[PDB]
Design a protein around this nucleic acid. Structure first.
Length: 341
DNA sequence: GGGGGAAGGATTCG
DNA sequence: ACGAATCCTTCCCCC
């Protein structure tokens, strides 16, 4: 089987560059301004010109400006990025029926029934890159390997504007020398748990007792790592369907006053409904991020679809249940809809 | 003991 | 180190 992974480099910032090409070569920083005070918020994405100096996703905007005071800071325009992304995904469908749209800037293509050997794959890759650069002016990195995981790892190693193949031989080596923390799907939390279990490389997962490994990171993640270690991971490329939709908004000031929170809650509901479009949810959850950044949620599932009027009234009951089951002030408030009919 | 689901905290990622 | 969506464990009903 042969998988080709496509990752759009520093996507949000690149799109801003395509929409205002005079930004090329300058440090571009796309941010989420939370509006709690001047420059409150964080960097969502930055191009290479800014990343090389340490300005990257997650760094507070204020901190970023101390490092690059003259870089260009832009607000996130998510809908534009999504429309651009969709056009690019369509260009990719021309290369394979079985395509998995992993995120706004990632997609996997199963080009087995389309190419033989890793020479034709590399060529199909260049073909895809040039195509995208031509039609949308966007640069992408391509990763090629036997499964989705190593296809992703190859791209991570070739970014930006790169292409890389990880053959069956490099795979076996990586299973020995790659930091377990560099394996997709393994975040910060899991990484630390594995180390304390004595696992720093994939190969090490085979030296531990499965019911011990499973006890720490869970059955699903355990089998995931074991499969990868034995060079047996072969999940099929298939695009999943959105299981839920929601919106969470940061309030100007923290508080626990119902009448002060409702406006934000309603704003979030209105936006979530617009996004739902023609989907009718049967489940609603209200989510509150407290002052100490801890998240509390309460939801309800109905035997039928939820109208917007039902959403408004139900969301207040859930928020009240939340304010009741926790004395902490709230900082962000929002909702999520799911179980679409 | 275990199947069918609802519920909410846990975890991943930009 | 400051938004979105799914994952994972627990609990409840009931055969």
């Amino acid at each position: 089987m042969i998988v080709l992974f496509v990752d759009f480099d520093y996507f949000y910032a690149q799109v801003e560059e395509v929409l205002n090409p005079s930004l090329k070569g300058k440090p571009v920083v796309v941010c989420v301004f939370s509006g709690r005070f001047e420059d409150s918020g964080a960097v969502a994405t930055a191009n290479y010109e800014a990343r090389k100096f340490g300005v990257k996703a997650g760094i507070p905007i204020v901190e970023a400006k101390k490092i690059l005071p003259n870089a260009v800071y832009l607000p996130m325009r998510k809908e534009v990025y999504q429309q651009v992304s969709s056009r690019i995904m369509n260009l990719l469908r021309e290369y394979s029926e079985k395509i998995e749209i992993a995120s706004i800037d990632e997609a996997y293509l199963d080009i087995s029934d389309k190419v033989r050997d890793y020479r034709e794959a590399y060529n199909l890759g260049l073909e895809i890159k040039n195509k995208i650069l031509e039609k949308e002016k966007i640069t992408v990195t391509v990763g090629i390997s036997k499964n989705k995981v190593f296809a992703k790892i190859a791209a991570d190693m070739a970014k930006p504007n790169g292409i890389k193949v990880i053959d069956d031989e490099e795979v076996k080596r990586l299973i020995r020398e790659l930091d377990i923390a560099d394996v997709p799907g393994i975040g910060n939390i899991t990484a630390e748990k594995l180390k304390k279990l004595g696992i720093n490389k994939l190969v090490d997962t085979l030296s531990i007792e499965f019911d011990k490994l499973k006890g720490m990171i869970g059955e699903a993640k355990a089998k995931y790592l074991i499969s990868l270690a034995r060079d047996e991971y072969n999940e099929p490329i298939r695009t999943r369907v959105r299981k839920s939709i929601g919106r969470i908004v940061t309030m100007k000031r923290n508080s626990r006053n119902l009448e002060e929170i409702k406006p934000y809650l309603f704003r979030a509901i209105e936006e979530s409904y617009y996004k739902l479009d023609k989907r009718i949810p049967k489940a609603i959850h209200v989510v509150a991020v407290t002052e100490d950044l801890d998240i509390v949620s309460r939801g309800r599932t109905f035997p039928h679809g939820i109208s917007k009027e039902t959403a408004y009234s139900e969301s207040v009951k859930l928020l009240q249940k939340i304010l009741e089951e926790d004395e902490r002030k709230i900082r962000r408030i929002g909702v999520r809809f799911s179980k679409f009919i």
